[PDB]
Design a protein around this nucleic acid. Structure first.
Lengths: 135, 118, 146, 73, 97, 52, 186, 133
RNA sequence: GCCGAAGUCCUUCGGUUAAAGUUCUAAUUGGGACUCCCUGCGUAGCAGGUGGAAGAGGGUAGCAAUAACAGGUCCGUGAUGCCCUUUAGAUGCUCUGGGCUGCACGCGUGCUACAAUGUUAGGACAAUAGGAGCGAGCCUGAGAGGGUGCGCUACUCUUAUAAUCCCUAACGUAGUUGGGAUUGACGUUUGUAAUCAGCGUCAUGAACCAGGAAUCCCUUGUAAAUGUGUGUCAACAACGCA
């Protein structure tokens, strides 16, 4: 056991003994598709275990997910893109998402939009029936 | 602190409807391309007139049936009587309610409140 | 017993399909025929697919397969190829349906092949040229010896 | 229960697998993960390491399952 | 001379087989040289009860379409005479090729 | 008269009614029949449809 | 019709049915007609009662190992698994598979059973080799479900111990419960 | 010398076509080694293992799926060998006996076809599921 | 048999109003199976067997007596008796908008799963329908989509190289590359309208480790799995009929 599991990076603690692009999925905001796009563009091997990744290599992967548009990415494959407030396409990650999505729910309640009500009441929003299902 | 697409309140008012609709959601610029004319034009005529007459108090209500109009910066801070199929429900417009469907703020149904047994 | 031909040497029909198509994939990576596109590399083969391909050199093994499948059906359209390389749609709660492949990935190849003259266009779909079906029976006698 | 094996092959256990694996007449990845307490992803890649060097031929090359033997010269 | 096709269509087979006999019969008299297409079942499957009551039972209504094609070389003089059968629920499209 | 709501591609267009029925509850559009089913099955043998 | 051998590997020359025992062998279906190159066949075996005897025995296993609800049909899958048993059987022990197979089909299916007090009836030889193949294959999938191990192996683990009469086996454990229940009720 | 006969399972139909030649048997445009399975390789050759060095057979197919398309070819090979010896009789009756000893499907074929779907149910004979009470 | 392309001495493709046909394809007229045949059992018939494409109503459907249920339908009808409505501030008809989709909860039919007999990635055969709407081929875009509109009044042209299965890899018994609900945003099509429609994209990554007492369907090309058409339809199938 020269290597380390339980590796802390980007405010989460992603797993080791778990092959890289699945390991980066433990972060909120990088998922299975975008994780492959980082590693492919990292660019190394998806299969290699997050056991290893020697810190000079790891410092690359954090620079990619923070600066995606910059690092040779199409932008269609981004978490936010064209945000109304900033009017700019950059994609959210880590502990931000759980706090920053909450604002986009909170602002609906202040407006009294139809969505903002059904978040507050704890019901289904998108136009599902709730006669029988959801109890 | 308010921006729409990294653009403040008055420069959205300055740039007019034609360039504005380049940066609505692509659900919504379909409604501007197809089926904008006549019914819609009267609205922003009438929401100009109630806005002009005011200057502390907020203006008189501009009643309207049609629920499926985009909210634009041009009519911010008007009052609108929006029909629920029942009553013209009245909403003073905020900056955060830009670029949305006008129906959303007239909810057609009651919340519920469940009682009792049966 | 086993099937036996005439004609001594090997042809594109004869040798097995899993083997032949990968030998013809290698025969583009050495020669610089086809090339990779540069825009692509992250794209799903088809919208229905849930992830990118594993192989990273996947572009060529597709580009081999289409030339193999122009050979076996003589004509090959784009919309005919798109229907072929699709599959069932796996995720959603409903029952599963056949959706099509991407067009652009397949179009990119069939233009890149007509640079090095391996497939002419014609009436109906595209049909491979005298240069083209020669290149298959090069590789048939490469893997026929093996 | 939570019967967790392990993702790492150690330098000690490699010296064991040279001795006792080629003694077995037919053995798969499945039966390594019984004895040496390891993941099958490693136990597949251990056998394909041994066959490239010397000893250990695949008895069956079939897709899905694989099962390795001795090396009769 | 503009080798002409008949195309004979029907609902019912006995009513068809009269017309085929006549239009084959008349090419014996005129002496014009004489050269079955696959039949369709137009299945419409209505629920037979009017209301929603009762066990869901379904009548099947096949309309059948028998279709034959005679054709021959013929000089416009001879063909006017042959065309003129007149049966219930039979059709005869004439087609020049 | 002349009802002003468009009804181009719509369930209560005047083409879409049972021709005999004058009502649209359960319409058979296939083969351009445009006939209501209860209306159909009274008078299906006249049209040349049959049970087999 | 000179070699005549299963999967193009094994032969039926062996298997000494006379040698195996008295009775039981008859409904075994390994007698010449039964031998075939591949156990796959166009069956017409469910038409009239005893026609199940005249089919090959190795096929009859591949049908049992077709469950449940996902593996229904897909016989062409099952005859890979039974192949990849019969490699593991042959190349481990060095016996050929068909001899050690039919010994498994002998000793699984219990003599006697509780006919619904409850009374202990005897069995037909037909119903023995039926409830051989069930209680083998039941144990295989019950073991193989969730187990990180290929079912071809988990067949071969079951199938060796059925021949040697061990209480490792899900077959030969479950008979000694069922046979003792018949002895108790009686 | 040439004979042209068919096999048929389920809704496969495979025609074969004997000539004189030098022991070539050819599915579609290719030798019947190449079916890519290892089960269904050995299934098509069951006719030939029992019993053609004169003959040259040329087989074409449509219909069915993967399995029933093979079972047509076993009919079409075996019947075309038997139909060759019948035309071109002593030896035909005894080589045909070797097939009918093995299995009846190599000459006869089977007439079973799928039962039509009936209303009130998802298939032919199944019905949906009752409630009561 | 001709003329092509490769192979490069005889193998495989594509084309052909060009000579002979009918094994596949299409559909009309007839033939065919009757317990006739043999052996057992009890004349009526029954059980097994040979042959036979098929053997016991050849398989599956369709049609289906008399006698009734105050079962259903006046929301199918220019089928209809009576009652009231026509006081037009109509229970006639029609326009804008909203409902039938509202949710502490209880039941019915279904769908997708709980994985390794698997999923992921790459590679390698159907039938029945429908279509003056289907929509060929070729360009454009990651994708959905978009533009141009060849053939077909259809065994000719078109929806249309189906999916389990098969063969090479990856994974490794974990609520895990199992599972894909619920939510945020962007990219679009159909439409007078998307506010409760469908499709795409990237993120979010839930309950579920095979289900108590109970209950349902099924005997052979049947069950179960596995897709494809069609009905409704501008758009939308987890449903019905095939």
């Amino acid at each position: 056991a020269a290597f380390r599991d339980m590796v802390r990076m980007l405010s989460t603690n992603v797993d080791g003994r778990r092959p890289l692009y699945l390991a980066l999925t433990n972060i909120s905001g990088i998922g299975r598709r975008f994780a492959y796009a980082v590693v492919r563009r990292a660019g190394l091997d998806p299969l290699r275990r997050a056991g290893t990744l020697t810190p000079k290599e790891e410092e690359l992967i954090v620079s990619i997910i923070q600066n995606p548009t910059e690092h040779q990415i199409p932008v269609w494959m981004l978490n936010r893109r064209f945000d109304r407030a900033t009017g700019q396409n950059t994609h959210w990650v880590a502990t931000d998402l759980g706090a920053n999505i909450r604002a986009e729910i909170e602002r609906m309640k202040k407006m009294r939009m139809k969505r903002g009500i059904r978040h507050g009441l704890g019901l289904k929003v998108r136009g599902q029936c709730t006669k029988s299902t959801g109890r | 602190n308010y921006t729409y697409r990294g653009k403040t309140l008055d420069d959205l008012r300055a740039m007019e409807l034609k360039d504005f609709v380049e940066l609505l959601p692509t659900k919504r610029r379909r409604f501007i391309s197809r089926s904008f004319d006549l019914k819609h034009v009267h609205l922003i005529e009438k929401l100009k007139k109630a806005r002009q007459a005011v200057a502390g108090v907020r203006p008189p209500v501009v009643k309207t049936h049609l629920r499926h109009m985009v909210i634009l910066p041009e009519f911010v801070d008007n009052v609108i009587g929006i029909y629920d199929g029942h009553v013209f429900f009245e909403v003073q417009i905020k900056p955060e309610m830009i670029g949305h469907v006008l129906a959303d703020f007239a909810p057609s149904k009651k919340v519920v409140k469940h009682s009792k047994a049966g | 017993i086993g099937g036996k031909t005439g004609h001594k040497g090997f042809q594109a029909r004869e040798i097995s399909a899993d083997v032949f198509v990968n030998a013809l994939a290698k025969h583009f990576q050495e020669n610089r025929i086809v090339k990779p596109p540069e825009w692509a590399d992250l794209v799903k083969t088809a919208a229905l697919k849930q992830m990118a391909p594993s192989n990273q050199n996947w572009f060529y093994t597709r580009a081999a397969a289409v030339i193999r499948q122009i050979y076996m059906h003589h004509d090959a359209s784009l919309s005919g190829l798109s229907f072929h390389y699709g599959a069932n749609l796996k995720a959603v709660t409903m029952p599963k349906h056949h959706h099509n492949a991407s067009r652009k990935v397949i179009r990119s190849i069939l233009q890149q092949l007509e640079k090095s003259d391996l497939v002419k266009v014609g009436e109906k779909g595209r049909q491979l040229t005298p240069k083209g079906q020669r290149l298959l029976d090069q590789v048939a006698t490469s893997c026929g010896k093996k | 229960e939570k019967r967790e094996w392990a993702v790492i092959i150690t330098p000690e256990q490699a010296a064991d697998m040279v001795k006792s694996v080629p003694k077995n007449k037919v053995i798969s990845a499945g039966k390594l993960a019984e004895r040496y307490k390891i993941s099958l992803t490693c136990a597949r890649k251990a056998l394909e390491a041994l066959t490239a060097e010397g000893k250990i031929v695949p008895v069956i090359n079939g897709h899905d399952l694989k099962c390795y033997g001795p090396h009769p010269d | 001379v503009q080798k002409i096709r008949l195309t004979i269509t029907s609902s019912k087979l006995p009513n068809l087989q009269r017309v085929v006999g006549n239009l084959m019969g008349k090419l014996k008299k005129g002496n014009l040289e004489v050269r079955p297409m696959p039949r369709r079942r137009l299945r419409i499957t209505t629920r037979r009860a009017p209301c929603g009551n009762g066990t869901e039972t379904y009548d099947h209504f096949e309309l059948r379409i028998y279709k034959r094609v005679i054709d021959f070389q013929g000089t416009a003089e001879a063909v006017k005479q042959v065309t003129q059968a007149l049966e219930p629920d039979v059709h005869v499209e004439v087609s020049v090729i | 008269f002349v009802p002003k709501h468009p009804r181009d591609n719509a369930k209560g267009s005047v083409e879409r009614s049972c021709r005999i029925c004058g009502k649209r509850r359960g319409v058979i559009r296939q083969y351009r029949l445009n006939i209501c089913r209860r209306c159909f099955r009274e008078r299906a043998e006249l049209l040349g449809f049959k049970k087999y | 019709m000179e070699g005549v051998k299963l999967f193009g590997k094994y032969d039926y020359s062996d298997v000494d049915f006379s040698q195996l025992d008295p009775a039981l062998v008859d409904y075994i279906s390994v007698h010449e007609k039964q031998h075939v190159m591949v156990p796959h066949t166009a069956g017409r075996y469910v038409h009239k009662r005893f026609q199940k005897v005249s089919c090959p025995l190795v096929e009859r296993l591949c049908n049992h190992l077709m469950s449940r609800g996902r593996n229904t049909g897909k016989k062409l899958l099952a005859i890979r698994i039974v192949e990849h048993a019969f490699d593991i059987i042959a190349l481990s022990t060095g016996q050929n598979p068909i001899v050690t197979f039919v010994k498994g089909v002998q000793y699984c299916g219990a003599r006697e059973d509780s006919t619904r007090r409850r009374q202990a009836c005897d069995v037909s030889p037909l119903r023995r080799i039926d409830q051989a193949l069930s209680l083998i294959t039941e144990g295989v999938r019950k073991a193989a479900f969730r187990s990180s191990r290929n079912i071809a192996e988990c067949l071969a683990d079951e199938l060796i111990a059925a021949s040697n009469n061990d209480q490792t086996s899900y077959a030969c454990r479950k008979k000694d419960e069922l046979e003792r229940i018949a002895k108790s009720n009686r | 010398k040439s004979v042209q006969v068919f096999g048929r399972k389920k809704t496969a139909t495979a025609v074969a076509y004997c000539c004189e030649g030098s022991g070539l048997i050819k599915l579609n445009g290719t030798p019947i080694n190449m079916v890519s399975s290892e089960t269904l390789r050995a299934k098509i050759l069951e006719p030939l293992q029992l019993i053609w060095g004169n003959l040259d057979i040329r087989v074409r197919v449509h219909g069915g799926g993967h399995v029933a398309q093979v079972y047509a070819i076993r009919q079409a090979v075996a019947k075309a060998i038997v139909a060759y010896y019948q035309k071109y009789e002593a030896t035909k009756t005894e080589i045909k006996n070797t097939l009918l000893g093995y299995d009846r499907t190599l000459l006869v074929a089977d007439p079973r076809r799928m039962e039509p779907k009936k209303f009130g149910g998802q298939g032919a004979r199944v019905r949906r599921q009752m409630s009561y009470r």
